[PDB]
Structures are given as C-alpha cells and as structure tokens.
Amino acid sequence: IDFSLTEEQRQLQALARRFAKEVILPVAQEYDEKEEVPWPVIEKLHEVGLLNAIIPEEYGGMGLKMLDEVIVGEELAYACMGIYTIPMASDLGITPVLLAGTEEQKERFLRPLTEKPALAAFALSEPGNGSDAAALKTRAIRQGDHYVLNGTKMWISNGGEAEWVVVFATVNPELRHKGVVALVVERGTPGFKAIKIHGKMGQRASGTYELVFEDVKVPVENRLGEEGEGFKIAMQTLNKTRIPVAAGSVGVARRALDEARKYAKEREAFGEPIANFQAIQFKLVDMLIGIETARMYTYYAAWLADQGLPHAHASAIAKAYASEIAFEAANQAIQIHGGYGYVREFPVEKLLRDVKLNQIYEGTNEIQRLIIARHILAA
Amino acid sequence: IDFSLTEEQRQLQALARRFAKEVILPVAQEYDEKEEVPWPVIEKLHEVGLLNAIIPEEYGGMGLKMLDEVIVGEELAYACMGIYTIPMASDLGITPVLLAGTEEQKERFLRPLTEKPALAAFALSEPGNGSDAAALKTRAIRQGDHYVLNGTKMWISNGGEAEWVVVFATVNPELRHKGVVALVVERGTPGFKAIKIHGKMGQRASGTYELVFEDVKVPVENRLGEEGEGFKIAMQTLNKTRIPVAAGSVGVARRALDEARKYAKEREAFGEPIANFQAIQFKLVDMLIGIETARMYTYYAAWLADQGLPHAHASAIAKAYASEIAFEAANQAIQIHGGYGYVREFPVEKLLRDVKLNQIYEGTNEIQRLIIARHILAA
Ligand SMILES: Cc1cc2nc3c(=O)[nH]c(=O)nc-3n(C[C@H](O)[C@H](O)[C@H](O)COP(=O)(O)OP(=O)(O)OC[C@H]3O[C@@H](n4cnc5c(N)ncnc54)[C@H](O)[C@@H]3O)c2cc1C
Ligand SMILES: Cc1cc2nc3c(=O)[nH]c(=O)nc-3n(C[C@H](O)[C@H](O)[C@H](O)COP(=O)(O)OP(=O)(O)OC[C@H]3O[C@@H](n4cnc5c(N)ncnc54)[C@H](O)[C@@H]3O)c2cc1C
Ligand SMILES: [Co+2]
Numbered sequence: 001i002d003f004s005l006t007e008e009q010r011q012l013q014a015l016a017r018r019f020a021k022e023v024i025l026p027v028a029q030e031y032d033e034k035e036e037v038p039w040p041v042i043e044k045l046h047e048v049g050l051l052n053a054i055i056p057e058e059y060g061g062m063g064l065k066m067l068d069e070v071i072v073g074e075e076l077a078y079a080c081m082g083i084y085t086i087p088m089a090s091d092l093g094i095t096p097v098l099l100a101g102t103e104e105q106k107e108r109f110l111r112p113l114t115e116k117p118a119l120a121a122f123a124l125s126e127p128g129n130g131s132d133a134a135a136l137k138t139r140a141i142r143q144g145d146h147y148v149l150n151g152t153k154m155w156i157s158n159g160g161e162a163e164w165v166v167v168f169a170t171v172n173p174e175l176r177h178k179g180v181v182a183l184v185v186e187r188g189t190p191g192f193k194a195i196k197i198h199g200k201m202g203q204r205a206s207g208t209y210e211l212v213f214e215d216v217k218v219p220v221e222n223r224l225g226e227e228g229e230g231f232k233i234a235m236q237t238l239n240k241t242r243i244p245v246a247a248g249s250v251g252v253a254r255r256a257l258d259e260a261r262k263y264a265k266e267r268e269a270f271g272e273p274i275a276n277f278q279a280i281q282f283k284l285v286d287m288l289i290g291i292e293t294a295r296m297y298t299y300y301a302a303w304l305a306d307q308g309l310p311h312a313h314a315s316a317i318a319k320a321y322a323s324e325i326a327f328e329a330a331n332q333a334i335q336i337h338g339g340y341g342y343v344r345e346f347p348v349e350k351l352l353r354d355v356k357l358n359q360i361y362e363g364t365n366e367i368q369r370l371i372i373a374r375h376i377l378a379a
Numbered sequence: 380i381d382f383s384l385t386e387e388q389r390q391l392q393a394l395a396r397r398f399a400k401e402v403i404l405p406v407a408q409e410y411d412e413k414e415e416v417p418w419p420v421i422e423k424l425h426e427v428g429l430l431n432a433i434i435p436e437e438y439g440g441m442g443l444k445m446l447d448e449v450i451v452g453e454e455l456a457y458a459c460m461g462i463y464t465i466p467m468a469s470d471l472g473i474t475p476v477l478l479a480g481t482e483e484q485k486e487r488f489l490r491p492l493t494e495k496p497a498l499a500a501f502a503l504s505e506p507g508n509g510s511d512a513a514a515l516k517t518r519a520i521r522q523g524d525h526y527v528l529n530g531t532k533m534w535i536s537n538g539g540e541a542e543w544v545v546v547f548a549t550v551n552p553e554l555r556h557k558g559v560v561a562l563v564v565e566r567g568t569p570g571f572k573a574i575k576i577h578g579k580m581g582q583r584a585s586g587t588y589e590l591v592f593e594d595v596k597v598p599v600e601n602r603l604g605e606e607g608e609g610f611k612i613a614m615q616t617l618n619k620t621r622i623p624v625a626a627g628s629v630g631v632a633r634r635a636l637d638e639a640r641k642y643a644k645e646r647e648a649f650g651e652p653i654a655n656f657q658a659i660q661f662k663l664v665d666m667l668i669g670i671e672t673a674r675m676y677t678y679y680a681a682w683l684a685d686q687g688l689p690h691a692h693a694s695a696i697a698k699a700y701a702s703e704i705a706f707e708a709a710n711q712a713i714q715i716h717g718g719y720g721y722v723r724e725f726p727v728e729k730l731l732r733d734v735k736l737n738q739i740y741e742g743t744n745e746i747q748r749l750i751i752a753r754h755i756l757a758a
C-alpha cells in the first residue's frame with residue numbers, strides 16, 4: 001500500500017494551487033456578487049493547460065486520471081467552489097463521450113475542447129424530474145439520419161456556454177431505464193434555446209441554465225452508444241464524476257479551516273486570541289477530522305476508478321460524507337468569525353452558500369444513501 | 380499511489396479472520412460474563428503465530444509492521460474488542476522496547492514473548508493522573524546500578540498476566556517531563572503487586588490492573604533509553620499504538636453493520652422485512668460511511684508510521700474518529716434489533732459496552748483533540 005503522490009502529481013498540484021491563489025481567489029467575491037461567468041478565468045485555465053485536461057493526449061488533453069482530478073479539484077474549489085464547478089461540469093459532459101463515444105466522435109467532440117477555451121455539458125435533470133433517470137420526459141424520436149429531440153432540461157451547469165451538450169432522452173417511456181439514449185447536441189443547432197437561471201444561493205459564478213429543445217434535429221452520428229444504453233451511460237458517468245464533487249467539498253472545508261484559524265489567531269476576546277479557547281480549538285479540530293478523513297476516502301475512491309474496480313458505492317460515500325463535513329466546517333468557520341463572519345466582507349459566509357449545493361447536485365445525499373443502501377442490502 | 384494489499388497481507392488477513400471466527404467469537408460472551416482472561420485463546424494466538432507478531436524476526440517474531448497490525452487488528456476486534464485488547468496491549472508493552480531498547484534488551488525481553496504464550500504491559504497512567512502524563516508521581520530514585528521504584532499505576536492492561544511491564548516514573552518531579560524515565564519491571568520482582576480490577580462495563584475478557592511498587596529494585600540494565608527520555612518514549616509509543624485502537628474500532632463497527640444487516644433482512648414488521656424501511660436503511664448506510672472512511676484513514680496513518688513520517692496528528696484523528704463512529708454504529712445496531720438487542724443472547728449490546736472504552740484509553744478523545752489542536756495552531 002502507498003498513499004504518496006508522484007513527482008508529476010505534486011507538480012500538477014502546485015500548478016493547480018498556484019492558479020487558484022493567483023487567478024481564482026482574487027475574483028471569487030466579484031463574480032459571486034455579479035452572478036456572471038468569469039470567462040477570463042476559463043481562458044486562463046485553458047492557457048495553463050488545466051481546462052478539460054481529462055481529455056486523453058490523443059485529442060490534445062493531458063489525459064489526466066481520476067486521482068489527478070481529485071488533486072486539481074481540491075485546489076481549485078479551495079479558492080471557489082462555484083468557479084470550480086465550471087471545469088468540473090465540463091469534465092462531466094466529457095465523461096459520456098469518453099465512455100461511449102467512438103474514436104471518430106472522441107476526436108470530433110473533444111478536439112475543439114483542447115484547442116481553445118471551450119466547455120462541455122451534461123443534461124440529465126428536468127423541471128419535474130432530477131432524481132430518476134428512468135422517468136425522463138425529454139423525448140428523442142429516431143427519424144432517418146437524425147433524432148427529433150423535444151423537451152426541457154433543468155439546472156444544467158455550463159448549459160449556455162458549452163459547445164455541445166450530452167442530452168439524455170427517452171425513445172420510449174414504457175421501456176423506462178431501457179428507453180434512454182445519449183445524444184450530443186451542438187450549440188448552434190436550431191430549436192435549441194438556453195435560458196440562464198438566476199438568484200442562486202451560491203456557486204453564483206457557475207452558469208446554470210434551463211435548456212429547451214424544440215424539434216431539434218440531432219444526427220445519429222451524435223448518439224453515444226446504442227439506444228437503450230443511455231441510462232447505463234448516465235450512471236457510469238455519475239459513479240466517477242461524484243468523486244470530484246467530494247474533492248471540491250474537501251477543498252471548501254480546507255478553505256474554511258484556513259480562514260477560521262487565521263482569524264482565531266488574530267482575533268482576541270477577554271484579553272487573548274480566541275484560538276486559545278478550547279471551544280474554538282475543538283471546532284477547528286472537528287474541521288480537520290472531516291477534511292483528512294474525507295480526502296483520504298476520496299483518494300481511495302479515485303484509486304478504485306483508476307484501477308477499473310467497482311466504485312459506485314465508494315464515490316457515493318465520498319460525495320455524501322465530504323459535502324456534509326464541508327457544510328459543517330463552513331458553518332463553524334462563520335461562527336468563529338462572529339459578526340464579521342456574517343458579511344461578504346469576509347469569505348466564510350460564501351463558503352456555506354457554495355458548499356450546500358454539493359449536497360444536492362449530481363444526485364442528492366439521500367439518493368447517495370439509497371445507492372449505498374443497495375450495495376449493503378444486495379446479496 | 381496504491382491502496383491494495385500484498386499477497387502476504389491477504390494471507391495474514393485470512394488467518395486473523397479465520398481465527399476470530401473459529402476461536403474468539405464462540406467464547407466472546409462466555410468470557411465477557413465471567414470477566415476472566417481466556418488463556419486458551421492466548422495460546423492459540425501464539426500457536427498460530429499472531430501473538431506479539433510485531434517482534435522482529437531476529438527475536439523469533441514475524442516483524443509485522445503497522446499496516447499489518449491494522450489488518451490483523453480489525454479482524455480480531457471484529458469477534459471481540461475485549462479479547463483483542465490483550466494482544467493489542469501486549470504490542471503496546473513491546474513498543475517502548477522496540478523504539479529504544481538495545482539489541483541486548485530486545486533479545487532478553489522479547490524472546491520470551493515469541494517462544495511461548497506470554498504478554499507484555501505498558502504502565503503510564505496512575506490513580507490521580509491519566510491525561511496529564513507528564514505529571515507522574517511514581518518515583519524512581521537511582522541508587523547506583525539500580526533504581527528504587529515507588530508508586531502506583533492504574534488501569535494497566537495485562538498488568539498481572541505480563542512477564543514484564545514497562546513502567547514510566549519520574550527521577551525528580553521538579554524536572555516535570557524532563558524527569559521521566561522508562562523502566563522494565565519483571566512480573567516477580569520483590570515489592571511489586573498486581574491487583575485485578577473488576578466490574579468493567581466492557582472489554583471484560585481483558586485483565587486490567589492496579590500495580591503497586593514498594594521499594595522495588597530495578598537495575599539500569601532495565602532502563603529503556605537515558606533518564607529524561609521517558610516522556611519521548613511514552614509519546615512516540617502512543618503516536619503509533621493509537622492506530623491499532625482505531626483498527627479495533629473499525630472492527631467493532633463492522634461487526635455492528637453485519638449483525639444489524641443480517642437481523643434487518645430477516646426481521647419482519649408491518650408485513651415486510653425491516654430492511655425495506657428507509658430509516659433502517661439509512662442507519663445501516665451511516666454505519667458503512669463511518670466504517671469505510673475510518674478504515675482508509677487508519678490505513679493512511681499506518682502508512683505514515685511505516686514510512687517513518689509524522690503521524691501524531693493522523694493517529695489521534697483516526698483513533699478519535701473511529702471510536703466515535705463505532706460507538707454510534709453499535710448503538711444503532713442495538714436499536715435495529717429492538718428488544719432483542721437489549722439482551723445478552725444477542726451480540727450487539729456487548730459491542731456498545733466494549734467500544735466505549737476505545738474513546739477513553741490510550742488517550743481520551745478530548746486529549747486526542749488537544750493533540751490535533753496543537754498540530755493545527757503550531758506556528
Ligand atoms: C446549481 C445546480 C446545478 C445543477 N447542475 C446539473 C447539471 O449540470 N447536470 C445535471 O444532470 N443535473 C444538474 N443539477 C441537478 C442535480 O443533479 C439533481 O439531480 C437535482 O437537484 C434533483 O433535483 P430535483 O429538484 O429534480 O428533484 P427531487 O428529487 O424532487 O428532490 C427530492 C428531494 O426528495 C428526496 N428524495 C427524492 N427521491 C427520494 C427517494 N426515493 N427516497 C428518499 N428521498 C428521496 C431528495 O433527496 C431531495 O431532498 C443541478 C442542480 C443545481 C441546484
Ligand atoms: C479499561 C482501561 C484500560 C487501560 N489500560 C491502560 C494501560 O494499559 N496503560 C496506560 O498507561 N493507561 C491505561 N489506561 C488509561 C488511559 O490510557 C488514560 O490515561 C486514562 O483513561 C485517563 O483516565 P483518567 O480517569 O485517569 O483521567 P482524567 O484525565 O482525569 O479524565 C479526564 C476527563 O477530563 C477530560 N480532560 C482531561 N484533561 C483535559 C484537558 N486538558 N482539556 C479538556 N478535557 C480534558 C478527559 O478527556 C476526560 O474526559 C486504561 C483505561 C481503561 C479505562
Ligand atoms: Co437529417
């Protein structure tokens with residue numbers, strides 16, 4: 001057994017950390033408040049080579065592995081989870097094509113994402129259904145050399161900025177999970193509207209959209225895998241992408257520990273740094289306990305995935321656990337700042353608003369638990 | 380990075396598992412109810428080569444490392460934390476000799492522990508002090524080639540069964556911690572009494588003692604290290620021995636999940652197995668989340684110790700966390716069993732009683748937190 005990073009990983013880690021501190025950390029507050037996408041950051045990401053870096057070297061990417069994503073993710077999310085959600089969501093949309101796409105499609109859909117500041121998206125959730133990929137309403141009717149796509153997708157990260165979206169739709173409701181098909185819908189395709197969602201509690205920098213497909217014609221050359229394989233694709237993707245959500249959570253929790261501690265040492269009350277008080281020390285200790293345990297289990301999950309081993313249960317545990325300790329951590333970080341923790345003039349407040357989302361998207365912690373329960377009760 | 384196990388480790392794991400299953404588990408309740416040491420089990424451990432296996436091959440042992448300890452410890456504790464505490468505490472007694480004993484002392488003291496079923500003991504705590512280690516009252520005054528030992532040690536595991544006991548005493552209270560020295564004391568030495576403690580809530584199979592020293596003569600040939608080095612020896616020992624306590628906790632928690640799972644699948648209520656109820660599924664899930672995350676972090680801490688890296692904070696985290704999630708798992712297992720979990724005929728009730736101790740000995744979880752707090756605030 002070994003839990004050590006290789007020389008390259010440390011390099012990637014340092015790079016990531018360097019980028020977060022110098023580029024993300026400074027504008028985090030700005031975009032959270034304007035609720036606009038920091039394109040200049042995305043551009044900066046691309047230039048430093050960390051945008052869509054999971055794309056194999058054969059198509060221009062770094063071929064970064066899950067362990068690598070975890071390494072980078074924790075660093076980015078540390079500066080801002082909302083901004084980190086942009087590249088994270090992009091890797092999510094990329095995942096289906098990596099798993100099901102052919103060499104032709106990989107080259108076609110992935111090349112444009114390594115050459116310039118471009119994003120990919122994953123559209124599964126809908127207005128009336130976000131937790132059951134077996135009851136999706138968006139319909140795809142095969143009509144010759146193309147599918148006629150009709151339906152509304154909801155809460156799509158990178159929805160309006162992406163070059164294309166992996167849309168999961170049903171070709172037959174009665175077939176339920178077996179009726180799902182994966183389709184790549186490109187940004188200009190006629191009858192494809194993107195409406196931006198506003199007024200979110202956090203991760204405001206990340207762009208979330210409602211996507212409307214009106215008689216959208218999507219070529220069969222844009223289908224990932226075969227009809228009836230859409231569900232398995234969405235599930236296999238989520239089993240992996242949930243790990244980065246766990247990684248991000250860890251990053252937010254770490255950022256909460258850093259702020260809290262720096263404040264605890266400097267701020268005094270009753271003639272002494274509050275850090276000297278045992279009640280405050282224990283809050284800080286509990287943060288580190290969750291952080292340390294969540295990161296190690298997140299690394300283990302990434303390891304399993306990178307080894308081709310079963311990891312649905314592990315990533316579900318990592319995602320639910322990390323996001324939960326990360327939320328408690330931000331809550332206490334605010335508490336430790338006192339009145340100053342309640343205003344955006346300080347960073348702890350935004351941490352709470354950001355991290356809460358990690359308990360909801362890419363599957364709520366309840367279905368995460370439902371996933372674990374299954375693994376447990378299975379025979 | 381690689382979390383997998385070597386072939387040897389897998390064999391070693393199967394050995395412990397098979398042993399726990401065939402030898403320990405059957406007599407668990409029996410020895411819990413008599414509160415007597417199960418010597419026949421100690422012989423079999425020896426017979427099978429797992430008793431004091433941490434003693435390097437040069438002295439007749441297996442030279443097991445921390446990671447191996449964790450692997451074996453989880454399986455043994457799985458059957459019974461109380462019985463496991465016997466070899467665990469014996470490993471604890473052996474550690475100060477391995478960390479600071481000369482080749483000569485190692486042979487003399489450890490060889491007797493590999494040739495036959497024999498135990499070692501670690502005595503640091505005293506009646507009026509357990510957390511404040513650096514304030515020991517037991518005096519060790521030097522009179523030439525020997526020390527005249529006087530005082531009392533409290534809660535000593537394997538206290539009366541041990542061949543020898545590593546005792547931590549002060550050579551001059553005024554030096555405070557700089558005045559601590561470590562001395563091996565042999566089971567029959569004149570002026571050395573061992574009084575068995577009775578009425579423990581759990582881990583009853585393990586003998587806990589009060590040791591009384593009255594003008595006990597200890598030759599310098601029995602001092603581990605130099606004077607004023609006792610504290611370092613005690614701390615360095617605990618920095619490593621805490622990992623096994625975390626291991627046992629994970630073991631107990633695993634037993635709770637297994638019992639609770641089995642029982643929930645078979646037990647019907649409202650015309651359905653209780654395992655079909657979400658609330659029941661969730662309890663099971665939180666058990667696994669705790670088991671999985673706690674085990675990987677214990678592995679990690681074990682890795683740092685084997686690699687020779689700083690692990691004081693990591694082991695304190697693993698110990699505090701694991702014992703805490705294990706207590707909750709045992710509690711929910713009792714709950715899931717209903718009325719039957721409240722009676723000795725079932726195994727869950729004892730799990731709660733046993734594992735509570737894991738949050739107190741080898742450092743309470745509060746001081747574990749104090750240790751982590753220092754790591755966090757260290758300028
Ligand atoms: C900012 C944001 C961005 C997002 N970006 C994306 C994206 O890019 N791509 C994407 O595909 N999705 C995205 N989502 C959606 C997310 O992945 C979830 O699927 C979604 O939030 C589910 O939402 P809901 O409102 O549809 O459904 P609901 O399922 O109606 O919410 C149900 C509530 O009931 C509980 N619940 C539901 N079913 C059960 C059950 N069987 N047992 C017990 N409890 C149950 C839930 O846990 C939850 O608390 C995003 C969401 C947000 C908020
Ligand atoms: C069954 C059993 C077996 C044991 N076997 C051994 C053994 O083999 N060898 C050995 O050396 N020891 C052994 N111990 C002792 C154990 O390692 C601890 O040292 C011991 O439990 C301390 O107990 P206490 O009752 O002496 O003291 P206390 O320290 O008086 O208990 C204090 C309580 O106050 C809290 N507390 C204390 N100081 C602080 C502080 N500064 N800040 C915040 N909270 C604080 C604690 O967390 C704890 O809840 C054993 C204990 C038990 C119960
Ligand atoms: Co056509």
